[PDB]
């Protein structure tokens, strides 16, 4: 049940992809995927490319996958190690969700950072107090790392 | 008018509202039709999150507008 579903997800991505984000098994191991996210053009991360590592647990689709960032991003909800626990992947998970919905949710999160879950309190404070400084810092980081 | 909502599982919801109707009224209608509390409802239109205290026309919502229900931010 944990392999036919993953094959179906890969086939669906190979037919009608989001055309911006991409996914693929690393070498030949269906339980370890690489993903690429294009920075949204309406957010300070525009022009950047981000890489994600997705681990599919054996209990898939009952248990959500584990996604971790690889490139550092100045975000109030992404820490230095780059871990996102957002409820689609820890609490609000149902078997009907696919891996493309997760990527769409993350690409939406890269535009509306959460203020009330200050995973990085310094960055959250900068965001809540000095919006212009926050956006300038985010663009500086995106130029610095995401290239 | 009529608007369309795509949920997490692919279910499509049709809502009979008006652009002058407030966000609170639309969320109340959605809760009545589905049972999802308005606070837990995160509807994205044109890549932006709608907020209470306003109307649909305040977000440039028109006939047969498409909304996507997404998951709340916890990070």
């Amino acid at each position: 049940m944990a392999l036919k579903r993953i094959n179906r997800e890969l086939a669906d991505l190979g037919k009608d992809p989001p055309s911006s984000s991409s996914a693929g098994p690393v070498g030949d191991d269906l339980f370890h995927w690489q993903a690429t996210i294009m920075g949204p053009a309406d957010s300070p991360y525009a022009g950047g490319v981000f890489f994600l590592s997705i681990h599919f647990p054996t209990d898939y689709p009952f248990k959500p996958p584990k996604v971790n960032f690889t490139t550092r991003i100045y975000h109030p909800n992404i820490n230095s190690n780059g871990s996102i626990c957002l409820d689609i992947l820890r609490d609000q998970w149902s078997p009907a969700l696919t891996i493309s919905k997760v990527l769409l949710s993350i690409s939406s999160l890269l535009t509306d950072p959460n203020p009330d879950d200050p995973l990085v309190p310094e960055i959250a404070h900068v965001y809540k107090t000095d919006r212009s400084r926050y956006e300038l810092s985010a663009r500086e980081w995106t130029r610095k790392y995401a290239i | 008018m009529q608007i369309f909502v795509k949920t997490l599982t692919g279910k499509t919801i049709t809502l009979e509202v008006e652009s002058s109707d407030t966000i609170d009224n639309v969320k109340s209608k959605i809760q009545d039709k589905e049972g999802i509390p308005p606070d837990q409802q995160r509807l994205i239109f044109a890549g932006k999150q709608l907020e209470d205290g306003r109307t649909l026309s305040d977000y440039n919502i028109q006939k047969e507008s498409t909304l996507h229900l997404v998951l709340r931010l916890r990070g």
Binding site: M1, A2, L3, K4, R5, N7, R8, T58, D59, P61, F62, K63, P64, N81, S83, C85, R90, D91, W93, S94, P95, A96, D117, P118, L119, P121 | T9, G10, R74
Partner: protein, 377 residues
């Protein structure tokens, strides 16, 4: 009152003629460092008649009085040794929700039956001689020991997300978009192997007319069929001393109390293994917080722990080996927010944001109000 009825049951159980100890004394000597090896060497050879005599325990090269405390310390060490997941016998149900259960991989050993019979003998010895372990299994384990039917709700104790997904499948309809079928993939030492819930199960898709049978088979396989031989050996070892007609007067909670005593959360370990952000050990909001945690009942402490971390269960070694959503993440106290706001909790990071209040009464009121909706123990 639950406590009075439980005491009546305990007295009736220990007054039975088939659970009466003898007068001769059995001296059981174990070295402190190698507790597990010597315990398995001695216990796994004792006769049932020998195990019913008075249990006298003396650690090697440690002469002292109050043998009761020595025996209690020995049972604590043995229970924290044999049930430790690193020994590849038991395992946590989930990393972020610490619940012990029999590990399916434990079958890799050439003879797991001897080890699990030893574990059963240890548990029977602990119950028989009025000594408490300190492990905390999951409710399905106790329901199995008493031979109770296991249903879907029992998966809630084991894994919350798994139970939520199963309930989702039960409630909403299932299409062909979900490529679900009667087979479970298990990764045993790298290689992934497929187990058929029903014969020729990998070629049967779960329509809307099969999802109930699919849920039944999944629950049975997850909770029972994966650990048949090992649990059979363990229960044989346990029933060697305690006849099954005696255990079947309790339930899944009274048996837990009998095995582990009254569950409590230590405060000294909690204080010694916490960290602060923007706070210092000499700050008033910390000393007041620890005084309040000192003079609190165990139920409210468990409620606070579940409110902050997310679960009311602790790892086998206290707060030292505490895991978060992403990895090791000890209990953290942070100064975040305005005075008026209630204390908040980030569960996936084990963080408690406590604003800088002005008096201990205010902190007590805010902290008691902020955890009302939480349920502990």
């Amino acid at each position: 009152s639950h406590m009075d009825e439980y005491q009546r049951k305990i007295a009736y159980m220990y007054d039975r003629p088939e659970m009466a100890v003898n007068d001769a004394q059995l001296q059981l000597k174990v070295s402190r460092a190698t507790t597990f090896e010597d315990a398995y060497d001695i216990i796994s050879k004792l006769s049932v008649s020998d195990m019913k005599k008075k249990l006298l325990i003396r650690f090697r090269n440690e002469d002292g009085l109050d043998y009761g405390g020595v025996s209690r310390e020995f049972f604590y060490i043995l229970s924290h040794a044999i049930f430790n997941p690193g020994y590849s016998l038991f395992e946590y149900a989930t990393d972020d929700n610490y619940g012990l259960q029999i590990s399916p991989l434990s079958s890799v050993n050439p003879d797991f039956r001897s080890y699990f019979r030893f574990v059963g003998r240890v548990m029977g010895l602990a119950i028989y001689h009025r000594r408490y372990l300190d492990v905390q299994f999951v409710l399905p384990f106790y329901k199995r020991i008493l031979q109770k039917p296991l249903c879907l709700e029992d998966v809630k104790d084991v894994d919350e997300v798994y139970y939520e997904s199963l309930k989702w499948i039960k409630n909403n309809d299932v299409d062909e978009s979900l490529c679900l079928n009667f087979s479970v993939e298990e990764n045993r030492f790298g290689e992934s192997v497929t187990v058929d819930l029903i014969p020729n199960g990998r070629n049967i898709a779960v329509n809307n007319q099969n999802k109930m049978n699919y849920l039944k088979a999944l629950t049975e396989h997850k909770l029972v069929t994966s650990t048949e031989e090992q649990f059979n050996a363990l229960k044989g070892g346990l029933n060697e001393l305690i006849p099954d007609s005696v255990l079947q007067i309790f339930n899944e909670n009274e048996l837990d109390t009998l095995l582990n005593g009254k569950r409590d959360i230590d405060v000294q370990d909690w204080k010694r293994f916490t960290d602060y952000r923007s706070y210092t050990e000499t700050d008033d909001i910390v000393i007041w917080f620890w005084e309040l945690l000192s003079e609190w009942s165990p139920e409210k402490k468990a409620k606070l722990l579940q409110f902050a971390t997310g679960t009311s269960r602790l790892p086998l070694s206290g707060f030292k080996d505490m895991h978060g959503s992403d990895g090791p993440r000890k209990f953290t106290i942070e100064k975040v927010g305005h005075i008026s706001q209630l204390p908040k909790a980030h569960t996936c990071f084990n963080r408690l944001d406590i604003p800088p209040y002005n008096s201990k009464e205010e902190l007590e009121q805010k902290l008691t109000i902020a955890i009302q909706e939480t349920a502990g123990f």
